[PDB]
């Protein structure tokens, strides 16, 4: 049957035609601040195991309010660390998808480290613009760290995204980079210099630790990503999985039933499937109607359309007719 | 600027789409009246030249009213020979384009011979379904002796076209053929069993000897198709070329004036031009309006549409977006 | 069948006749000022992607209004191109066609430079007096960037072509120069000296992305030139291929039916036809009757005439007698 | 006397001077397909030859 | 000729007119200064310069 497909290929009956090209651009905003967090919390763990390598150097530091010096430094190395991905994200998106760049990371930073300890490489390596293959859009994400970033080069004021905590402090980071590298307890790996990140940061996460993938397995992540992402204990991005819908349930006030995993009924039937699903609810307080359907009450002192938007990995089949359908069938049963 | 190219040809920017596939058939209607009468008059010539060689075996055989012998028998071997034309192009149609052969060639004749002189030889072999290639559509044209048929079995009466003077007669055909074999003056040759046939029979006849392709002579025809189209003395289609039609101009009666060569001037300015050009007018004598333009009169007691459907060989470009601009002059800048 | 063909061809009887000789010149304007903010728009991108080496290098520049930085650089930049493009059509015109250099190209200009970037090397090779083969008429396209030029000497209020942004600056453009020369991302290739360009500027666009070939692929052009036509997201010249129009239908009011993709009731049926094809639809809101059909009214409180140009690739035939005829059918048949 | 529509090109005093070129071009090839015409190409001298200096005389 | 090759903004602007020269030989001075009097370039001052000369504003 190959000779009638080199027949609808060289006259272009079917074909592999898609409407978005290969690593279609897609902004997903970062949390930045909830990271923030868990990277401070997990990392004041290991710093107040070994406080006595850093004792010496950080008495001339005072914390700000109530925080133990431990969380204090571990708070200097991530704001650090996050002010230097910001820079790693840049200049990765400066190479591929050179748009990207110029709309939302045209602003340049100096970096003050090119050496981290090997979890936070490994996520600088990982935090680049992702490639997702295999799902219907062939996909590079590109991570954003915040909308608006608010610059000053004051560097004791500087806050370049919306956290709270976020402490930027030269002779700390620098005194504590030395500190690690000579003491033989603690590693320190070289920034790389990739282009394309890896999938640990765009898992989307749910109300129990149902953490689940929306693309493959197989060319996309390997269980060192989740290993990276079980690190980080909070999402790195919103849900970006999809989801079948159902039709809107309507009550006079909130006499909701609660929802039930147990499957109370959902009004329309299943559309798609996942070999893992999430069920989810969500409750609107404060609607009244649409107004052509306030019009309509009004009027009465009905008709409705909806737009489905079908998607697709490719359009197969280009150009049909029985012309063709009948020389591909003689050509093989002829 | 190659390396360019395949990024644009990978993901699918540019390309080489068709909405027509590669022999794309069209339905010519033949003369098969001017044919027929200009290949008796040229054939008769060449049996009254040679007729000491006839005379004794057509005694048997009357012309119907006032015809001479020569011109009778060749009238039998058009005849015959167009018969046989007719199964021609029905076993080539039933191979290629096998929907043709339903609708157009469905009804079976029996051919009377597989042996004529040369060149009615050589016009069955290029009265097949001819192949046109560089045109803007990549055609098929087949060629139809008849929109209808009015078939019967008597062979005598037996007119299955709408020809004058078509004559079967088997004991003619025959003994002229035995004849025909035995002189060493006349050629013989062998119907050929191609199925694509040649474009002597496409080219447009004019008012004058201006015969004139709409074709391209490379992959086409090699003036060995001119001369066969020079011994048919006659057009053997309709006028199929190209023409840019000016605008009409009205006149109260015919007052028009003659039509100039020198070139009398034409309404629109030219859009698409030929190395070589034909010029004629077509007056229309009795045009009232458009019913919607006598409205408009009568209501007087304007609004101008007009449909242009442009026609290309292919189309370059399919999906135009500046992320893949702005990619693919990177690649080759940078 | 050569002898009868050879016979036919020592007299004039028949050849290979056309009324333009091979390479017919035909003059094409340029857009010049789509292209030009096309080719800003594209630009400034890859100068913002490198900004940090035309910061310090622009700060003794100021943007005439709102306009950014890169865009004034790419303005600049692809205005000393257009003017060099005008050079490098004068000298190519020189050495084919001299009388397009006698009529439109005979005021001197030396370039303002030798070297560009690949892209605009490219086109400075492509937008040449190029030739087109295998469509009807055999065409050298000469491209015009305007109809009058409106030289000056001060190259500060230099602007020959009627470009709204055109701005020329020798230092800014030479600094630049200097800029892309030094740097190791950009790379710049010197202007090739040929004469014949290449069909990159010549495709017709149409309603969506519909870009399309109106001359075979063959011996025209090889998916390098669509690239470049891609690159220029605009088109280059005004629309060039064939068109098959019908009548024109007329409205009183503006109740005209809107162009439906449902392939409104054209009038005419259609008598040339392509692989691909575009259906538009033009209109005339206020067209005055033309001069006679008022007549007609005026006397009345009509003969129609139509001038058709048949243009064809050649001309097969030449004298046609029947003795001719009857030679070649004698010499192959006997 | 110069001039750029070579239509009404007649840069010296002529009278049936003519500027075509659709018929030159084309009665070039002409010239050139032929195998009884023959067509060189202009040489690039500088001196010329007294071919046109005699003088011309009554009979 | 040497702005032409050198600076053709300067050839624009300034040196457009075509002229062909009465000689090609002089005496050995004159076709020194010849040498010498065109587009010269300076370098180690504060501007990195090519000086053309001009032999007069209106021509």
């Given amino acids: ?19 978005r090209y290969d690593k279609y651009r897609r902004y997903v905003l970062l949390r930045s601040s909830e990271i923030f967090t868990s990277l401070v919390a997990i990392y004041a763990h290991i710093f107040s195991s070994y406080w006595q390598h850093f004792r010496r150097f950080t008495d001339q530091f005072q914390a700000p309010t109530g925080v133990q010096l431990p969380t204090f430094v571990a708070r200097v190395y991530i704001s650090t660390w996050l002010h230097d991905l910001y820079c790693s994200i840049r200049e990765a998106t400066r190479s591929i998808s050179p748009l990207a760049f110029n709309e939302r990371y045209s602003y340049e930073l100096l970096p003050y480290s090119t050496e981290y300890d090997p979890f936070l490489a490994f996520l600088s390596m990982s935090i680049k613009p992702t490639h997702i293959q295999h ?19 004051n560097e004791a004021n500087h806050n370049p995204f919306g956290i709270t905590n976020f402490t930027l402090n030269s002779n700390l980071f620098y005194g504590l980079l030395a500190i690690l590298k000579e003491r033989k307890e ?31 397995r ?11 992402a079980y690190i980080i ?3 790195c991005t919103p849900k970006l999985g999809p989801s079948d819908d159902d039709a809107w349930k309507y009550y006079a006030s909130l006499n909701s039933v609660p929802t039930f995993t147990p499957t109370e009924p959902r009004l329309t039937n299943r559309r798609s499937y996942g ?3 999430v069920r989810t609810r969500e409750t609107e307080n404060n609607y009244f109607l649409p107004d052509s359907l306030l019009n309509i009450i009004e009027d009465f002192t009905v008709i409705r359309t909806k737009i489905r938007d079908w998607y697709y990995h490719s359009r197969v089949i280009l150009e049909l007719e029985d012309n063709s359908r009948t020389a591909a069938l003689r050509m093989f049963i002829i």
Same sequence: chains 1, 2, 3.
């Fill in 1 to 19: 049957l190959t000779r009638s497909a080199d027949y609808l290929l060289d006259n272009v009956r079917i074909g592999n035609h898609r409407q």
């Fill in 135 to 153: 799902t219907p859009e062939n996909t590079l994400w590109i991570p954003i760290l915040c909308e608006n970033y608010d610059w000053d080069r």
């Fill in 186 to 216: 603690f590693k320190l790996s070289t920034l790389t210099t990739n282009t394309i990140g890896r999938p640990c940061w765009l898992f989307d996460w749910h109300d129990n630790v149902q953490v689940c993938a929306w693309f493959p």
């Fill in 218 to 228: 197989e060319a996309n992540f390997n269980s060192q990503d989740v290993t990276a």
């Fill in 233 to 235: 204990g909070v999402a």
């Fill in 275 to 277: 070999a893992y699903e």
